[PDB]
Amino acid sequence: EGALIRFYVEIEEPEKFLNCVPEELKETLLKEKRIYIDVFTTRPDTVFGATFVVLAPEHPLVPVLACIGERLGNACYSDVENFVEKMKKMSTRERTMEEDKEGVFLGVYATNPANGEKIPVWSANYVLYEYGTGAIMCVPAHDQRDWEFAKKYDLPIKVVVKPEGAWDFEKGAYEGKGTLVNSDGFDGLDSETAKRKITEWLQDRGLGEKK
């Protein structure tokens, strides 16, 4: 149980980037000026708290988005390539026995469909291609794996599920239930209710589905 959520990289001048993308993505790029990054989440109640996106190293969009990020002057393509190559060699245990999460910035920013914020797209070892779509939204305030990655790479922490009791978000992620904050029209909702309400809203807009 969860939601597919359609994040997307907006591309204002598609002709400048056409050679970064395969034929299969060209239609959407030219017509919609977007490259979609579909994520699966069991926490759609936290979507407003997404401060970055992570693709598994083997995700087909990694070279596509890195090509674009190089083209924008934001990414080091060789850094990305070296990371993917290193990851081909690492076992599941070696990628998830986390005493130093590893990732690389792809140089592009995905638009969050919930709030329109532009958030950086990374690839990282701790995200397995086999989980969901192989790309995740990262909510360091409420996901411990994401919190640790954000700590290492200096990424923003945004609280969207407020616990009733005290919590120092500068010490760990709060993974439990609460009421929404920083969630625009969904502010004040209990987080379980918000899972449904947010998912239906995205689905109504063609930017998500119950899954």
From Swiss-Prot:
Lineage: superkingdom: Bacteria
Compartments, as annotated in UniProt: Cytoplasm
Cystine crosslinks: none
Quaternary structure, from the entry: Seems to consist of an alpha chain and a beta chain.
Family: Belongs to the class-I aminoacyl-tRNA synthetase family.
Stated name of the protein: Leucine--tRNA ligase subunit alpha
Organism: Aquifex aeolicus (strain VF5)
First and last residues shown, out of full length: 228 to 438 of 634
